[PDB]
Write a protein that binds this DNA or RNA. Structure first.
Lengths: 107, 107
DNA sequence: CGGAATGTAGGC
DNA sequence: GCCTACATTCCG
């Protein structure tokens, strides 16, 4: 439909949801995946899982239009898998780091 | 072998971990449980899972004494299970509601 | 205790 | 439908 705005994507975060973007190297390139945690703690990685979640709980403030799985949407916490001699290692990115990482997964 | 400070239990939150306290109606009474998320997104509910995770991952600033499974330690995000005629909703507590939930599960 | 066996859920 | 990855159970 219409692309969701930062503000709409921040809405479920005021009603007990968490949003994360997680970046790592695959086949050719670096890619991002978006995770959501529902207020009960359930991890969801696919849009239709959120649709199934929303229809199983009471329809209030939070609707499908507030959800984006786009790793380019700078809302929530960002993390990246860095390969090192000590092993694969996840680090949370600073606000200042996020823009370079979104540029690197656009396309 | 000695009590961990709030400052120390907040430290892994500055290194890509998350702590949550979740308060549900149990068998008899209201009880809380503590979850940690490792920087990789792994959910851990028991202290021996954390020690096992620390032993198989790069040993940076975060060490075993920075961790508490106490639902009466006000560090991280708090959620409670609120049952109504509309159904079981989980809701995130404000900073202002937290001290009264902790009192209610002290005891 | 640290790993293997088995169960489960969601991904493809 | 099976497969992969995670959660839980089981073992000496």
């Amino acid at each position: 439909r219409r692309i969701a705005t930062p503000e709409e994507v921040r809405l479920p975060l005021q009603h007990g949801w968490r949003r994360e973007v997680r970046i790592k190297k695959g086949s050719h390139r670096w890619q991002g995946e978006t995770w959501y945690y529902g207020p009960c703690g359930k991890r969801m990685k696919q849009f239709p899982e959120v649709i199934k979640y929303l229809s199983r709980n009471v329809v209030h403030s939070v609707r499908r239009e507030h959800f984006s799985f786009s790793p380019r949407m700078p809302v929530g916490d960002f993390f990246e898998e860095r390969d090192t001699p000590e092993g694969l290692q996840w680090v949370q990115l600073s606000a200042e780091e996020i823009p370079s990482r979104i540029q690197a997964i656009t396309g």
